[model samples]
Target: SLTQLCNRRKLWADFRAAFARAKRLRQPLSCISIDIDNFKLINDQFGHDKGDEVLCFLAKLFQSVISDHHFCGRVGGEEFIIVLENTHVETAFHLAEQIRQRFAEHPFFEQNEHIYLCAGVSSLHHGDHDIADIYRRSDQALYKAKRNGRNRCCIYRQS
Candidate 1:
């Protein structure tokens, strides 16, 4: 059940099709991508088992924070992706901030220590384009988060 929920394939295809439709209608379909900061450090400090526990904790956190109208998945180790169907940059930015805060304040415990999370968000507010472009934008934003701080969120500028 968790695998079904967190895997990328669950929504990537349908979302791509939605992007196609949006392009046809000249509409907007926004997407967001996020990454956790310094995840390996957690694994190194705590055992891999606890590292996994933190991952599962993050998985549950996302489910609790987000509701319908959005798609979320573990895109890679220590990374996640979200698709917000008709979202705008401002809304996505706010949502990213919320997640960042939630993760930061969650008091993650592994080896009796704490961990932090960082994220980035990007939205396609202008003309429709390839779905993957959304990822590139969101990824750039996420990298900015790492540059700014360990536990933070950033939004990609359209320009």
Candidate 2:
């Protein structure tokens, strides 16, 4: 998309290989789903063009901070996904917190306000049949963050 992050197509394409890696042996893969709280306020308050600029800023923030081995994609509209391989769930959670805290710490938008992010982290489990299972599980955890209050990261547990 305009954010210069991986598009939806590339996201899934990469996920397939990552998902396959987790299938054969005991490889670890974690998925982190992130949502920007009240993202519409920016586009509604400002024009769409400026909204794109905001996306660019956020993309760079994630791109710069994310691990080199892992890759992230803009799932479009304030939602992003990070796929981390050979990483544990706790590490992914900390990564999410690092990102969330950075954005939450200070005001970055035009409204003199800060935007908080919520992340749901989940590691691959054998029960997962396909790539979407991880997506489904992580999203479920994300909903918890949205419900629990916006700005925090939570992990999905299977044990």
- Per-residue C-alpha lDDT of model 2 across residues 85-158, encoded as one tens digit per residue: 88888888888888888878756655666678899999888788898999998998998889988787889975
Most accurate candidate by TM-score: 2
TM-score of each: 0.86, 0.89
Q: What is residue 128's positional error in candidate 1, in angstroms?
A: 4.4
lDDT of 1 by residue, 68-99 (tens): 56777888988888777666678777777777
Total clashing residue pairs per candidate?
0, 0
Give Cα distance to truth, residue 8, candidate 1, Å. 2.3
Give the CA lDDT, 0 to 100, for residue 117 in model 2: 82
Q: Which window of 10 residues has the lowest lDDT sum in candidate 2?
A: 1-10
TM-score, predicted candidate 2 vs. hidden true structure = 0.89
